[PDB]
Structure 1
Amino acid sequence: MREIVHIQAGQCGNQIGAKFWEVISDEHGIDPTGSYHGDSDLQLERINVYYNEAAGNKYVPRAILVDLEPGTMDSVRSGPFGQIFRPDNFVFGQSGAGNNWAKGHYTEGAELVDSVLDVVRKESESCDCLQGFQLTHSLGGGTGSGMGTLLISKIREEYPDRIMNTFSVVPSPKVSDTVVEPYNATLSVHQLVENTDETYCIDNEALYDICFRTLKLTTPTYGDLNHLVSATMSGVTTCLRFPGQLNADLRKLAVNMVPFPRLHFFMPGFAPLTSRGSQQYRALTVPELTQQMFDAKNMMAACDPRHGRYLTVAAVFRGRMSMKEVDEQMLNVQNKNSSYFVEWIPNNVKTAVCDIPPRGLKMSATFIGNSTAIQELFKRISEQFTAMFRRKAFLHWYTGEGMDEMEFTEAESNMNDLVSEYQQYQDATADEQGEFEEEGEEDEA
């Protein structure tokens, strides 16, 4: 009745998609054959939101799969749920970006994007009630980053008022997964910020910490992480896909989460997270959900929210709650922690509560938070970029793909402006812009 399209871009953007789509096949009853075999009439009622109804109890996902290497594409299709992705919804190169954000954006990924856009059009002209687009991706990568951004900027040219949601991995804190991360992430931002409505900043070392801390596993791999994340992208879209006491459309959270037009980078979170040897012990309650989601060290993001103030926060519940307790735990956590909140945005919360829980489990909630603490990540990446750029480090490779020195300088300037702004939203007072004045005379002539 309303319909979503999704983009799986680059290695990471697609590896997350393959486990996201596993989670979202199971939620709608759907076997890896690409047919239903499910357990509710309500799984089918809204099977349309993700999927196209193909003939004779057949579903295919509204997924379009984008890369310049074929490698993970071979691994999706020889992988679990492979048979479900229709062949024409794979659209890829055989030459790569080779981590170069610019070789995505300007050289090779640009030579593919129109042929992508066909597959995007085939899908968009067939869901009349088209509501928005999604992407998953790397921010520091060459491909999900360098091509998925131009693709987003050409999606936003064709679908101008529809929602744009963006599910980034970010660069790594202490050491890098790819050396050019500070330039990939900063080039990426100056395409994103004028073309997305929602951006989600996931930190893989926060998922590695969350895995050893709250799930208490020493050996978490991509499958554990690609499931830990998929509750956010499942979560955020549950109150669309199933009934609730507060149903919520995608725009219904963006319009609560974003107070100014570039202020739309988020810290995600989830509850509950508990190890296999302690799920027997921690309580299945709405104060445990709320205080698990607002735990500073429960954030799936590079930053400690006690370093900032929350502009806005949404909180999506799942399962069968007292609405009184949903409200009373938001009331409490804001009374207990008021000084981590932008005080001229009084009452900083958006709730949504879906009646339908995660598989075979009593309850959950999904956090999407707007702290200013997010400025620490873009501070890092601007100070890092500065140290590569005032030396021409790696810069031959990207200017070698035709980028002018003004392109990196506008980008850095653009990031710096976003960072300067974030300071101007942080700890701010309800001030009204007046200046010092003094008395006249009453001795009239």
Structure 2
Amino acid sequence: REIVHIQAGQCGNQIGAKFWEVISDEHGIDPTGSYHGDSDLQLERINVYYNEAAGNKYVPRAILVDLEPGTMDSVRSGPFGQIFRPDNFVFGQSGAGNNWAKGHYTEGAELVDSVLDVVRKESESCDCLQGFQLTHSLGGGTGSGMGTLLISKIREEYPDRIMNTFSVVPSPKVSDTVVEPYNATLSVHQLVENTDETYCIDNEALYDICFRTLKLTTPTYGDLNHLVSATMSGVTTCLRFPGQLNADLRKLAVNMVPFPRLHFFMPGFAPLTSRGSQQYRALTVPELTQQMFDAKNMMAACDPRHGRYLTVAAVFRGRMSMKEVDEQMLNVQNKNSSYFVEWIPNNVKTAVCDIPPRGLKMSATFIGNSTAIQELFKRISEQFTAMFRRKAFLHWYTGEGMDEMEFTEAESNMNDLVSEYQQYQD
């Protein structure tokens, strides 16, 4: 099987560097080097993310889409930056304006064809394609607009292969941009109707989870990114490993989406202990479920405790008892019968790889489909209206060839999306 990552925008890009920083080491691939793999198993399934050309050069099969040179020229001028074949860099030296409209209708719409071109060169690579990984932020141009287009096109070209989306939904407390809800509401819209698996991460849900669950005092972006990339590795790549009970994107999809919206999840990693001290090793297993299922530790902003779950997928990856795994999951399902929805006898989807995260003994990625994420699109949707009402920075959109009915559309859509999700919380 296979997949082809997609680094839309700067963020989605910045993260690319971290997702590939990791993944590679979790596959023994040095900058341009080959497979130094401490083992022999980190190779029989690599294909999922690379391509064979030289014999020591397995190149990441991702796409780097962005209308701001400097960015990709920071990712390509640093560490692992020199492993991507230049063909991968689909830049847009234009003005990468922070407008969803500027990267979806006017500026991005041009650079698109020169992207799809490659997304096809990579898809028609070899063997059988599974789906595409998509990273980006719903709070900018090259991210929400242009990346949200990249998919609307992808999903027309292969409505068969899957589409996981890793979105950095606009954090609450403080917005790292101003129109944010504009660029956001507009991209979520496109998401709820193309990709079929979305993993929403919040820069501040991370800080928290990174400053209190990792006594880490100076959580640089690199970190946040790093933590995130840690989860997306547990998801995909991982399951493309052996296991007593292994799954793969689809299983994950076909066990997690009760209703076609596409629904968005909230990823959570397992061993998340501070370096030295904490290295408690309390990782027998009840310790991992202890972790994963708590409020804090959910990369999302919202707290599960604020709304039932529809599905859950503990994708563990480290030798354990299909008994102490299958078992724990249960008590968990009974101690919290309250929030776990009922019309699904077994919400949880236990998954079990074998080999764990390179240096760790036992981990377990969590992919939750809780109704709690209602209380986020609400947020976003609110911010919109409060500012849409006055058409705040709307001239930067319309003036870019947009529509007063376009914004209406998205909000509503994504706004209805909130509605539905409640239809199950009840």
Normalised by the size of structure 1, how large is the TM-score? 0.93
How far is the alpha carbon of 1:134 from its aligned partner?
A: 1.0
Q: What displacement does 1:242 show? A: 1.4
Which secondary structure state, in structure 1, belongs to the residue aligned with residue 90 of structure 2?
Answer: strand
Most deviating of 275-284 and 364-373: 275-284
Write the deviation string for residues 19-40 of structure 1: whole angstroms up to 9, x where unpaired.
1101111111111123222222
Partner-residue secondary structure (3-state), 1:54: coil
User: How many Å apart are 1:161 and its aligned residue?
Assistant: 1.1
- Residue 281 of structure 1: CA displacement? 2.7
* Deviation per residue, 1:408-428 (Å, 9 max, x gap): 111111122111212222xxx
2:407 and 2:232 mapped to 1: Cα distance? Answer: 32
Query: Secondary structure of the residue that 2:41 maps to in structure 1?
Result: helix
Q: Is the 8 A contact 2:195 2:262 kept in 1?
A: no
The 3 A distance-change label for structure 1 pair 282 and 357 is closer
The one-character-per-residue Cα deviations of 1:345-383 (angstroms, maximum 9, x if unpaired) are 221100111101112111101000011110111111111
Shift of 1:143: 0.9
More strand by share: 1
Tell me if structure 2 keeps the 8 A contact 1:290–1:330. Answer: yes
How far did 1:398 drift? 0.6
SS class of match (1:60) = coil
1:311 positional shift: 1.0
CA distance in 2, matches of 1:190, 1:380: 15
State the SS of the aligned residue for 1:206. helix
2:311 is the alignment partner of 1:285:
no
Aligned partners of 2:406, 2:79: CA distance in 1, in Å?
Answer: 41
Q: Which moved more, 1:33-42 or 1:187-196?
A: 33-42
Q: Is the 8 A contact 1:316 1:366 kept in 2?
A: yes
Segment drifting more, 271-280 vs 252-261:
271-280
The one-character-per-residue Cα deviations of 1:117-175 (angstroms, maximum 9, x if unpaired) are: 11111111122311111100001121121101111011111111110000011102012
Q: How far off is 1:282 after superposition? A: 4.8
- Alpha-carbon separation, structure 1, partners of 2:269 and 2:36: 29
Q: Note the C-alpha offset of 1:110.
A: 0.4
Question: Could you say what secondary structure the match of 1:202 adopts?
Answer: coil
| Alpha-carbon distance between aligned partners in 2 of 1:346 and 1:9, rounded to the nearest angstrom | 38
Report the counterpart of residue 204 of structure 2 in structure 1: 205
Mapped to 1, the partners of 2:143 and 2:353 lie a distance apart of 31
- SS of the residue aligned with 2:108? coil
Contact 2:166 / 2:200 at 8 angstroms: preserved in 1?
A: yes
Summarize deviations over 1:183-241 as a string: whole Å, max 9, x none: 11111122111111101111111110011111111111112111111121100114432
Match of 1:432 in 2: none
Aligned partners of 2:63 and 2:89 also within 8 Å: yes
Output one character per residue of 1:90-121: Cα deviation in whole Å (capped at 9) or x when no partner.
11011233210110010101010001111111
Partner of 1:413: 412
Is the contact between residue 238 and residue 354 of structure 1 (CA under 8 Å) also seen in structure 2? no
Shift, 1:46, TM fit:
1.3
Structure 1 residue 263, shift from structure 2 partner: 4.9
Mapped partners of 2:364, 2:346: distance in 1: 19
**CA contact 1:9–1:144 (8 Å) conserved in 2:** yes
Structure 1 residue 47, shift from structure 2 partner: 1.9
Structure 2 match to 1:359: 358
Contact 1:138 1:145 in 2 (8 A): yes
Query: How many residues are aligned here?
Result: 426
User: 2 CA distance for matches of 1:278 and 1:331?
Assistant: 31
Q: Does the 8 A contact of 1:239 with 1:246 survive in 2?
A: no
Supply the distance in 2 between the matched residues of 1:170 and 1:15 (Cα, whole angstroms). 16
2:57 and 2:370 mapped to 1: Cα distance? 43
Q: Distance in 1 between matches of 2:37 and 2:286?
A: 32
Per the alignment, in what secondary structure is the counterpart of residue 52 of structure 2? strand
* 8 Å CA contact retained: 2:273, 2:279: no
For residues 45 and 415 of structure 2, the distance between their equivalents in structure 1, rounded to whole angstroms, comes to 43
Listed one character per residue, the Cα deviations across residues 293-348 of structure 1 (whole Å, up to 9, x for unaligned) are 00111111110111101111111001100110111110111111110111112211
Matches of 2:113 and 2:421, distance apart in 1: 36
Instruction: Report SS of the residue matched to 1:236.
Output: helix
Q: Which runs of 5+ in 2 are unaligned?
A: none
Larger displacement relative to structure 2 (276-285 or 388-397): 276-285
CA distance in 2, matches of 1:382, 1:280: 41
Contact 2:197-2:262 within 8 A present in 1 as well: no
Distance 1:177 1:30, change over 3 A: same
For the residue of structure 2 that corresponds to 1:194, the secondary structure is: coil
Give the match for residue 330 of structure 2: 331
Structure-2 separation of matches of 1:178 and 1:193: 23
Change (3 A) 1:211 1:71: same
**Matched residues in 2 for 1:38 and 1:373: separation?**
40
SS in 1 for 2:4: strand
Is the 8 Å Cα contact of residues 239 and 248 (structure 1) preserved in structure 2? Answer: no
SS across alignment from 1:166? strand
Is residue 2:195 matched to residue 1:193?
no
Conservation of the 8 A alpha-carbon contact between 2:67 and 2:93? yes
The structure that has the greater radius of gyration is: 1
Paired with 1:108 and 1:280, the residues of 2 have a C-alpha distance of: 49
C-alpha contact (below 8 Å) 2:236/2:249 kept by paired residues: yes
Contact 1:34 1:83 (8 Å CA) reproduced:
no
Task: Call closer, same or farther: CA 1:255–1:96 in 2, change over 3 Å.
Answer: farther
Alpha-carbon distance between aligned partners in 2 of 1:23 and 1:390, rounded to the nearest angstrom: 44
Matches of 1:83 and 1:386, distance apart in 2: 44
Question: Which deviates the most, 178-187 or 30-39?
Answer: 30-39
